[PDB]
Design a protein around this ligand. Sequence first.
Ligand SMILES: [Cl-]
Ligand SMILES: [Cl-]
Ligand SMILES: [Cl-]
Ligand SMILES: [Mg+2]
Ligand SMILES: [Mg+2]
Ligand SMILES: [Mg+2]
Ligand SMILES: [Mg+2]
Ligand SMILES: [Mg+2]
Ligand SMILES: [Mg+2]
Ligand SMILES: [Mg+2]
Ligand SMILES: [Mg+2]
Ligand SMILES: [Mg+2]
Ligand SMILES: [Mg+2]
Ligand SMILES: [Mg+2]
Ligand SMILES: [Mg+2]
Ligand SMILES: [Mg+2]
Ligand SMILES: [Mg+2]
Ligand SMILES: [Mg+2]
Ligand SMILES: [Mg+2]
Ligand code: NA
Ligand code: NA
Ligand code: NA
Ligand code: NA
Ligand code: NA
Ligand code: NA
Ligand code: NA
Ligand code: NA
Ligand code: NA
Ligand code: NA
Ligand code: NA
Ligand code: NA
Ligand code: NA
Lengths: 65, 56, 35, 46, 84, 150
Amino acid sequence: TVLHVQEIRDMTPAEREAELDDLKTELLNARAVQAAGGAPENPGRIKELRKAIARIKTIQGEEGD
Amino acid sequence: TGAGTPSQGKKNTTTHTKCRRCGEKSYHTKKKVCSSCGFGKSAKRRDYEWQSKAGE
Amino acid sequence: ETAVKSELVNVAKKVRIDGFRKGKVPMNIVAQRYG
Amino acid sequence: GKKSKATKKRLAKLDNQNSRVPAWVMLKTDERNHKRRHWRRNDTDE
Amino acid sequence: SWDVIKHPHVTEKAMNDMDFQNKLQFAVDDRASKGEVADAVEEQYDVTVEQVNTQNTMDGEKKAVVRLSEDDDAQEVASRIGVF
Amino acid sequence: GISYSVEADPDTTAKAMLRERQMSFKHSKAIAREIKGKTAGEAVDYLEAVIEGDQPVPFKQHNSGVGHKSKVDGWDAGRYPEKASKAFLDLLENAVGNADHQGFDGEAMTIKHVAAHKVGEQQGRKPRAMGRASAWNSPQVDVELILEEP
RNA sequence: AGGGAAACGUGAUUCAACCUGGGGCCCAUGAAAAGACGAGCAUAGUGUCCGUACCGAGAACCGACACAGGUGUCCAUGGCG
RNA sequence: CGCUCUAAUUGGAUGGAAGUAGGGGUGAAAACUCCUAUGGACCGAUUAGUGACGAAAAUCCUGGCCAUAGUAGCAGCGAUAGUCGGGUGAGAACCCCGACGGCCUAAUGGAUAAGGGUUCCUCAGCACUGCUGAUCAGCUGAGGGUUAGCCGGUCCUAAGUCAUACCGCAACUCGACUAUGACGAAAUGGGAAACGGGUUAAUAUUCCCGUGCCACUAUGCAGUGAAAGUUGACGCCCUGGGGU
RNA sequence: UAUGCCAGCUGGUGGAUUGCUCGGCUCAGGCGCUGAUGAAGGACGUGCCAAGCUGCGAUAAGCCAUGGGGAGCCGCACGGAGGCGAAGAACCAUGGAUUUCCGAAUGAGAAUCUCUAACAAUUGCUUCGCGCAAUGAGGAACCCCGAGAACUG
Ligand SMILES: [Cl-]
Ligand SMILES: [Cl-]
Ligand SMILES: [Cl-]
Ligand SMILES: [Mg+2]
Ligand SMILES: [Mg+2]
Ligand SMILES: [Mg+2]
Ligand SMILES: [Mg+2]
Ligand SMILES: [Mg+2]
Ligand SMILES: [Mg+2]
Ligand SMILES: [Mg+2]
Ligand SMILES: [Mg+2]
Ligand SMILES: [Mg+2]
Ligand SMILES: [Mg+2]
Ligand SMILES: [Mg+2]
Ligand SMILES: [Mg+2]
Ligand SMILES: [Mg+2]
Ligand SMILES: [Mg+2]
Ligand SMILES: [Mg+2]
Ligand SMILES: [Mg+2]
Ligand code: NA
Ligand code: NA
Ligand code: NA
Ligand code: NA
Ligand code: NA
Ligand code: NA
Ligand code: NA
Ligand code: NA
Ligand code: NA
Ligand code: NA
Ligand code: NA
Ligand code: NA
Ligand code: NA
């Protein structure tokens, strides 16, 4: 959602990898918050993070990195 | 020493196991042959026409 | 001592949260807050 | 008996599958975990 | 490709290992060696990992007890890693 | 489960039941047959006594091998089913409670109707010799009670 | 160093273990391979992976059962007798 | 006569069908029909067709249920065991504390192999399981726990196994030999290295404190010897000495 | 009049009957190969909470493009919380991406793990270098070549 495909294609092979290691981390910091019986969660995003990263990896494929 | 109950005691040997190839507990870790799929014996899947009635 | 958390402090003794034995919980793990 | 990594991983799943059907599901389906296995009454493979 | 650090293992014993011994417990991908375990933890959190102890849980996942250097503080690191 | 097999006038009646109780269905009949027509109170004091072992219950039907009792009037064999009696006291305590709450004088009311019905067995298996297993079930009982102004 | 509330012993006999010898027997003559030694010292770095809970039995194993059955090894030097 | 479904002709039904319970009538009879309650949605008649078509019987099959019976067993074993106070609890003959009284001494003690598989710890329970009860549990529910260069596996080779080749076979997932390779010992074979103390609800020669050891590699010095030999590396009986 | 016999009435037990059918059974038309560009099958994962199934494969009940579609949606699964959608989702068709391990299983070993670069084995071509290729297995039966009973009559 917050991250649309178009926006991903309007990135540079660098921006993608950067945006990538950024999501990967927001992901980790959610799994952490959840691993600690944390309730400040919002299941609607820890799901998106995965998807987001999916797309990004999907684009990296198409664009040839 | 009766062959019934009494002789059931020593039965603490491991033989048949979760075959790596099929997923059935038929891998005889002693012969290393799957009584179910033929793994370890045949590269082809163990099968027989008698595992079903003659006209079926 | 705490007029903002005495109702949060005096909880740790009766919280039984996942992974932690009654009363042996780090207060900032009990950092979960409502009200 | 000495188990192996692969084995352990399975005993593990097995143990995992041995939990009850969560309450929330019960309501979400407006109404049993047939795969319930006791460590003594039942026998697992291998 | 798979990722090493899966998440922080927070339970009583975990904390005590942090508070009194300066170690941090995570759940890692079982194909991860102690070494791989280290480097990853160092790169993600900016710390120097001295020792890493590993156990293959009855959960199918691997647990890792990673001790930091007296220069770093688990309690503090743990604050940045969700947890606290 | 059952239902009140007897029509009851709400203006002068008080109902009460027991559900899938695990007790001797055979004792329940005896006790019922024995406390019918009695005053809820006389009924309690009776059971309590039975429980104590001072007053026996006439086992007229399921008496096989039962030992004769001196205090049994007009009959011989009898016992002291306590568990059953307790279950029956409860049945009354609710019966007497419901009454009072409606304005009636519980204790003083008569047991117009009471009857035990076997609503089923809680199946169980019993290992036997030669490697065979024989049924080994627990009786599940229901019982009704209807009080009426004297 | 540690441990003990404290004292924080000395000698003795018989001595499992463990060490090392002598003797006798066989129409029985009692494994192998990897490895070690032969072939020193200082400092530093490295030592990955897998097992590691508990039962181990007149209730946690086999015997359909919390089955008076069956099931291997070590403690064979606790006192009296 | 009655049953299923199809066709033609022709009817009934939520102003209540089928079925079911009780009751009335007809037919010699198979059986038809009506009434009342129930039910709450389908149901017939005639003709022509159809057929996995009519059971009281097979030590018939499957399900249910009664008597048996509140009966047999919960005694019989060289391990006859409990008792009095008290704790908790809605509830305590058997859950826990104390005392008194016993039971087990190659085992009813301690450590393990296989096997089991989380049965381990904690909290919360008692509808299930527990030969009675249970506030207990190896039960149920929710959380947690198994941290090793120096304990094992890993390596080695044993009887013996497999794979590839070669050959045989109609042929193979079959088959003896010969070669090459690999596999084959977690108490109980051989085997480079760790001890003591402390610590947890549960791990522990694995974590923490102290101290020690081993292998490889690198750097530095010493050495040019290094391959012969020794060890690993071993039957049974008797016995002396050393010695904790 | 105990114990009790026969029929019924009220309730129970039980699951027959009638009605129903998200499943079967049989027939008919269409269509029909997959695999070393590693299948078919299995293992283990994959959801906010997720045990079964289905789907998927560490991009894990999903990613992308084009067409269809439409205000709705987040599988079976009618919970609690949160979220996605006119930056036109859900859903459908086609093409693409990803696609863990075991598995013919092919570097080597192994009960789905592990040990130090691989067409393992057998072939053809051959720059005689695994350089270029092949075989290996699956499939409801059908089909072809071989080996070939006995009960029974
Ligand atoms: Cl009965
Ligand atoms: Cl001598
Ligand atoms: Cl071990
Ligand atoms: Mg025999
Ligand atoms: Mg380890
Ligand atoms: Mg008698
Ligand atoms: Mg038996
Ligand atoms: Mg242990
Ligand atoms: Mg016992
Ligand atoms: Mg007509
Ligand atoms: Mg009798
Ligand atoms: Mg005695
Ligand atoms: Mg569990
Ligand atoms: Mg316990
Ligand atoms: Mg408790
Ligand atoms: Mg070997
Ligand atoms: Mg050894
Ligand atoms: Mg323990
Ligand atoms: Mg291979
Ligand atoms: Na987890
Ligand atoms: Na078992
Ligand atoms: Na009688
Ligand atoms: Na009398
Ligand atoms: Na009398
Ligand atoms: Na002695
Ligand atoms: Na028939
Ligand atoms: Na008891
Ligand atoms: Na087709
Ligand atoms: Na699920
Ligand atoms: Na696919
Ligand atoms: Na090939
Ligand atoms: Na070549």
